[PDB]
């Protein structure tokens, strides 16, 4: 159950980083989601600025994202720098919670959820 | 692993049209979502009025629907006629935005507002 | 994609009951969701208090859950007692709506939704 569309990278996109969709010229542009925002989707490949890319979207349950800092199992997560995922406690910016442990730079597996886990 | 349910078409349903769920006697019913309403899902096959179907619903951030008129990238979309997707200027009726161009009758891909990301 | 992780039961958990997740000591802890709360998932097997268990979470838009009382198609559902699903009128507590009927104690199928049907 995959749905695909073509996009243009408006800035360099690295694999396993959170993505924002934006209005380009006759095309959707993708870029790393901004810090402390709710992402639109997640990248699974690296795209160079200005290149076309096929964005394949899958049913939502869990995402694999690079950790922007140390993440503990059960942390609530928001967007960090460069489209990474980082812990937060601001409920209005949470988009998921970690179910694996990850040091900064490692791939974290998170469950998509706009509600925080009770700590 | 998928959790399915039986549904009955309240009226004739066409593949890749927007659907609304409604209560029936011992059956959830499906029909094309009404003009300018927020849809519940999208049909995968034709279902004649009165016939049953197994709904295999996925939580998606993007849908593919038949365009009811010409659509430009980024247009905000609501339900048109016969369960199609069309642009609108009324924010309270929008359920997603187009991520590609489509002419009337062409499949259009769109990104949903009311997903697990809302 | 689905995810599989190892959790610890904070309390006794029964098959097809609503679950709440909480943060434990570098592990997710599970227990029956509390009455009138929004659950995080549903158990597929009994788990004794203190035991580790393998949770497999799939991309599902519908769940199967034990009914806490008689449920009719279209009922908006919240968490009842002992992790069961019951009808409710409080919009703040709804987590889905029934798409099949179920007597108390049987399995009901529901579509996940923070909004009431219609």
Residue numbers in the entry:
A (entry chain A): 1 to 119
B (entry chain E), C (entry chain C): 1 to 118
Lines quoted from the article behind this entry:
The bacteriophage ϕ29, a representative of bacteriophages with a short non-contractile tail, has an ~19 kb dsDNA genome encoding ~20 proteins. Both 5ʹ ends of the genome are covalently connected to the terminal protein gene product 3 (gp3). ϕ29 infects the Gram-positive Bacillus subtilis cells by injecting the genome–gp3 complex into the host-cell cytoplasm using a short non-contractile tail, leaving the genome emptied virion on the cell surface. Here, we report the cryo-electron microscopy (cryo-EM) structural studies of the ϕ29 prohead, the mature and the genome-emptied virions at near-atomic resolutions up to 3.2 Å. Our results show structural details of the complex capsid, the DNA packaging motor and the entire tail machinery, and provide a molecular basis for understanding the assembly, maturation and infection mechanisms of the bacteriophage ϕ29.
Each of the head fibers is a homotrimer of gp8.516,19, which consists of a pseudo-hexagonal base and a protruding stem with a unique three-stranded helix-turn-helix supercoil structure. We also determined the crystal structure of the N-terminal pseudo-hexagonal base (gp8.5 N-base, residues 1–116) to a resolution of 1.8 Å by molecular replacement using the EM map as a search model. The crystal structure shows a similar homotrimer with a β-strand missing from each gp8.5-N-βA domain of the trimer. The results showed that the N-terminal 110 residues of gp8.5 form two small β-barrel domains (gp8.5-N-βA and N-βB) connected by a short linker (residues 58–61). The two small β-barrel domains are similar to each other. The monomers in the trimer are associated with each other through hydrophobic interactions and have large buried surfaces in between them. The head fibers at the quasi-3-fold positions can further stabilize the capsid.
